[PDB]
């Protein structure tokens with residue numbers, strides 16, 4: 248009556264600390280055991296194993312090692328080649344299999360003993376498709392990283408069949424992590440609207456290679472597929488005027504939810520990040536927030552089921568588990584406002600296709616919530632008729648315009664004086680009188696800067712390149 | 721006691737037998753296509769089905785020998801995007817106009 252043993256299969260690192268998903272699995276069980284309100288008479292016990300995340304025969308050993316030892320649930324080996332092997336074990340023996348990451352589920356896989364707390368890309372691909380219609384785009388440039396990313400965005404690729412989009416699908420390079428040959432082809436083709444399908448470890452890597460090129464301007468709009476845009480250390484891109492947009496399921500508005508994330512930073516003291524990683528220092532990823540929710544959703548199901556005795560099964564002798572079909576129905580019929588918001592399941596598949604996103608975007612202050620997505624509501628983008636707040640902070644009517652010009656009598660001259668100190672004041676003439684009375688009417692500030700070539704404008708035939716002031720424009 | 725295992729011929733089942741045949745040493749001869757992930761460090765397998773790194777380049781040669789500009793690629797299941805990813809990336813460099821259904 249005192250133990251309900253859960254099973255865990257996690258990444259084996261060789262020298263570093265515990266993984267982000269494993270430490271959340273530790274922190275979730277220790278929270279429920281201390282706070283005696285939830286499960287007042289049962290105390291949870293964890294049994295974590297280590298695999299290589301690419302060895303489906305090693306992951307099939309650790310699943311049978313936990314079934315012979317006796318567990319009640321197995322919380323995922325978190326990879327597409329390894330989770331398919333453990334799912335068919337958990338479907339056979341009866342024990343539920345709680346997944347916290349996305350997996351390509353084939354159409355004829357007749358499995359029922361699994362749930363997935365990661366949001367389905369049948370809903371996330373419809374949410375990205377609502378942002379390419381709220382922003383009224385016509386040409387997108389969807390960029391992924393591996394070949395599985397076409398399945399994650401197949402409701403976006405099929406969009407020109409019915410809407411007026413024009414897809415140009417590209418791919419990041421496989422071996423290297425230098426996207427300079429990719430981003431140069433995107434600048435040259437005039438592609439200002441990009442949808443990156445990356446992880447947040449590679450999303451910070453592209454933006455340092457998009458800042459080293461001239462692509463972090465006020466023209467470019469970037470929509471990111473990942474749910475960890477909020478973990479980017481966006482200090483240098485903050486004043487550029489770039490239009491970074493993305494989603495967020497991690498409910499960082501509640502006081503109770505934000506208190507748990509602050510306690511998460513007090514458990515990762517010995518973890519110095521890279522200074523050139525481009526990420527923040529103390530935060531919870533959405534890969535570890537779902538594992539914190541995955542322990543709580545199952546703990547709701549053991550609250551409504553007190554006769555639960557953990558049995559010991561054998562893989563070679565195929566015997567189903569006694570309380571398998573009843574305990575699995577209690578997991579799919581659950582509701583829990585965890586760290587990732589409202590949690591409910593598809594009830595036909597076991598997937599998660601009903602959730603609450605928060606559309607975030609990059610402003611001068613940083614990332615701010617500018618919307619809310621909900622599958623049977625569409626985008627509730629606030630955006631409103633107010634829009635920008637009360638007045639213009641640190642009034643942008645300066646924005647000092649670097650008015651280029653050339654000197655020619657009597658349009659632009661040098662002033663004939665003896666005192667030496669000048670700068671945008673040594674000029675006089677006709678155009679300087681004109682520019683001074685356009686700044687009086689429109690209310691801007693101007694800083695005269697002569698062209699350093701001394702030409703007006705010319706189409707150089709042997710080069711196809713401009714020559715003069717229109718080159719500076 | 722066997723010497724070779726000639727495939728269970730499905731993407732969810734062949735990945736489980738490949739990691740057994742990689743472990744024990746016995747070769748694993750595959751006769752159908754399978755999505756092989758990039759970080760699968762396996763060596764004891766061969767695949768006699770033609771790769772779609774070559775078949776997708778052969779279909780791309782017939783949409784240029786026939787001089788097309790608008791194709792309407794139709795698949796049946798979500799794995800078929802991986803089988804034709806060298807055809808979907810074609811408007812990035814050529815003058816095709818994909819409409820995927």
Ligand SMILES: *[C@@H]1O[C@H](CO)[C@@H](O[C@@H]2O[C@H](CO)[C@@H](O[C@@H]3O[C@H](CO[C@H]4O[C@H](CO)[C@@H](O)[C@H](O)[C@@H]4O)[C@@H](O)[C@H](O[C@H]4O[C@H](CO)[C@@H](O)[C@H](O)[C@@H]4O)[C@@H]3O)[C@H](O)[C@H]2NC(C)=O)[C@H](O)[C@H]1NC(C)=O
Nearest residue numbers: 369373374377592593594595596598600601622623624625
């Ligand atoms: C999980 O549970 C969900 C709901 O809880 C079940 O329904 C799936 O999810 C959505 C429901 O809205 C479906 O996606 C939508 O499909 C619409 C098509 O309508 C019908 O058309 C086919 C063809 O005849 C029918 O067979 C089928 O029953 C569909 O119901 C589209 O019109 C929708 O497009 C737009 O919808 C709204 C409109 O404002 C927007 O908010 C959207 O962003 C979008 O632009 C939308 O595509 C989904 O297709 C349903 N699944 C299935 C299989 O039909 C599911 O049963 C359940 N399982 C899964 C895997 O989702």
Ligand SMILES: *[C@@H]1O[C@H](CO)[C@@H](O[C@@H]2O[C@H](CO)[C@@H](O)[C@H](O)[C@H]2NC(C)=O)[C@H](O)[C@H]1NC(C)=O
Nearest residue numbers: 381382439465466467468488489490491609635
């Ligand atoms: C980048 O973000 C700013 C935020 O205000 C966008 O500014 C306005 O966007 C609306 C469309 O949603 C336009 O109708 C306004 O004219 C914009 N005001 C400006 C530019 O002063 C801006 O458009 C965004 N850049 C894009 C989408 O390329």
Ligand SMILES: *[C@@H]1O[C@H](CO)[C@@H](O[C@@H]2O[C@H](CO)[C@@H](O)[C@H](O)[C@H]2NC(C)=O)[C@H](O)[C@H]1NC(C)=O
Nearest residue numbers: 617618619620621623624625626627628629630
């Ligand atoms: C969409 O708009 C807001 C969120 O953007 C939703 O919430 C409403 O906000 C207004 C302004 O403070 C309140 O007066 C309402 O009481 C809020 N409604 C709630 C909390 O239910 C609003 O409901 C949404 N409208 C829809 C979905 O039609």
Ligand SMILES: *[C@@H]1O[C@H](CO)[C@@H](O)[C@H](O)[C@H]1NC(C)=O
Nearest residue numbers: 278279281282283284285503
């Ligand atoms: C334990 O968690 C619940 C929420 O599930 C909360 O209401 C309660 O206050 C917590 N216990 C303590 C002692 O704070």
Ligand SMILES: *[C@@H]1O[C@H](CO)[C@@H](O)[C@H](O)[C@H]1NC(C)=O
Nearest residue numbers: 248249286287288289553554
């Ligand atoms: C655990 O506690 C609840 C409430 O205190 C009680 O109703 C339940 O019967 C207890 N479980 C047992 C005794 O197994």
Ligand SMILES: *[C@@H]1O[C@H](CO)[C@@H](O)[C@H](O)[C@H]1NC(C)=O
Nearest residue numbers: 640641642643644645646647
């Ligand atoms: C104009 O706005 C404020 C003055 O209110 C000033 O501090 C700011 O630097 C100016 N902006 C420019 C020059 O771009």
